[PDB]
From Swiss-Prot, chains B, C:
Heme binds at H50. Signal peptide: none annotated. Residues 59-107 form the PAC domain. The chain holds residues 151 to 257 of 505 of the full protein. Putative oxygen sensor; modulates the activity of FixJ, a transcriptional activator of nitrogen fixation fixK gene. FixL probably acts as a kinase that phosphorylates FixJ. This is Sensor protein FixL. Residues 1-58 form the PAS domain.
Amino acid sequence: PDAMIVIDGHGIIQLFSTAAERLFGWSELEAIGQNVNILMPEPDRSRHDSYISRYRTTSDPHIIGIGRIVTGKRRDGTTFPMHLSIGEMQSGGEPYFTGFVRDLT
Amino acid sequence: TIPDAMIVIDGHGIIQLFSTAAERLFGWSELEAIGQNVNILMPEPDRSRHDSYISRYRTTSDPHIIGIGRIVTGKRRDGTTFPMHLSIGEMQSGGEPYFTGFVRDLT
Amino acid sequence: TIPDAMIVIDGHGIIQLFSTAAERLFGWSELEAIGQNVNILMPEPDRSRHDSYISRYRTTSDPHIIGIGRIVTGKRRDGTTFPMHLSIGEMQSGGEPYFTGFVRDLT
Amino acid sequence: PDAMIVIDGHGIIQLFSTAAERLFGWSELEAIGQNVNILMPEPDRSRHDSYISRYRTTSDPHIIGIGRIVTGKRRDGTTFPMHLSIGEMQSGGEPYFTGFVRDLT
Ligand code: HEM
Ligand code: HEM
Ligand code: HEM
Ligand code: HEM
Ligand SMILES: [Cl-]
Ligand SMILES: [Cl-]
Ligand code: NA
């Protein structure tokens, strides 16, 4: 599952793999530091922080360990179907989330 | 923060993804690392034992490093070793387990 | 097992030698390539960063690609891009650094 | 454009540049797979494997990074003064050497 993205518990991109660069069009340096919400169209884009926040409060997963086909958005605005799997992991008493993204095109 | 040296293995210890920073630290490119057992990145005897670490974790769900991390010793392609902090997370994709390893070089 | 596409640059990224298999792959004759910056064989953002990559190496002696290797994107004369594996070595001749890059087309 | 030859850790020619063809007379096809010692007169020709082996053993260079004027031998039997510079390269976990050959004639 080629394109990999790691975010912190606020949605901020920490790692952005070479497959993610080719899929999403953002260079790794550009993507790191940006909110992962840049990688999706509305309505998900404006809602994404809520999804993270809701998970952190509730611990109730919806995509983590479940996976879902969703719409992603390339740097150039174009949208594409993709499968999303997500994992969690802790470092320093903070969570980080790893996403694997499959371009269904 | 989280290290940028990241390694993804499947539930058989086979490297699936090997980040640029991991390439640099271990001295393998992803081209050569993908498909090899992650045990190539460590000295003996951990190397000979590592498949059992993974396999027994899968049957017991008793983690040792997962979620807490540990200072271990890594081995580069050229056989040189280094102290490293290892962080491991677990995930599921397509109903299969994968583990995400983050490595910080302590040289 | 070493690629037959081989490029040699000086310590300022300027192409010194361009093997026949580099010519095929990148679409430049050795005659046009020599004297140009190696950055012509790559897309942005690496292209406008490449001099800095070379100079950072000359400063730190800590390689990113030398002795490790990397999959990157190369760019042909015609503007089309391709996946490639890059290996790089360092040598010295007449007291100046030169870099020998070997390119494997991953298409 | 100077002549360029790549050999492996046992002195076997892996690449032989157009200028090396023009200079030494051997086509790249003919040169690849032969020992680099084909390109020199005696006694270097007989001793050359031992030069490579000592370098691999000791790491004490004599020409690598140093350069020397030596004599080179053409496919057609004739010899010629030449300057030699040698680099080391690792690819796929194994040593290669790159040689640059300046014809002094
Ligand atoms: C780029 C396309 C993405 C889309 C369209 C998307 C969409 C979604 C949606 C709809 C949810 C909420 C599920 C629900 O309430 O039904 C969600 C939750 C979440 N997403 Fe994203 N996401 C994307 C990328 C990512 C990536 C790449 C990561 C990690 C690096 C990530 C991390 C999370 C996390 C941690 C949650 C909360 C956990 C959960 O609800 O299971 N997302 N995402
Ligand atoms: C390269 C240097 C590494 C060394 C020296 C090393 C060593 C170890 C050791 C000694 C254990 C057993 C812990 C114990 O039983 O006390 C362990 C467990 C484990 N390691 Fe490795 N490891 C390394 C890299 C990695 C990486 C990069 C990953 C994932 C990509 C990984 C995945 C695992 C997993 C899944 C377990 C079982 C989970 C656990 O016990 O918490 N290892 N490792
Ligand atoms: C044509 C496609 C190429 C690309 C896309 C490329 C890109 C890069 C990148 C990404 C780095 C590391 C920068 C970093 O991670 O900070 C690098 C370093 C370097 N590259 Fe290039 N390169 C290419 C071709 C070559 C060639 C053919 C040579 C030699 C003839 C070369 C010589 C070097 C040197 C000397 C370094 C610094 C040494 C090091 O850090 O290991 N490049 N290059
Ligand atoms: C064609 C004419 C050549 C001659 C006469 C020649 C001669 C020599 C000599 C005399 C030495 C040993 C230094 C000493 O102990 O005095 C040497 C070492 C070596 N030569 Fe050659 N060589 C030739 C071509 C090449 C080429 C084209 C390569 C690489 C492609 C090469 C690779 C080496 C290597 C790797 C060593 C060991 C490194 C060292 O001692 O510095 N040689 N060669
Ligand atoms: Cl999944
Ligand atoms: Cl020299
Ligand atoms: Na950034």
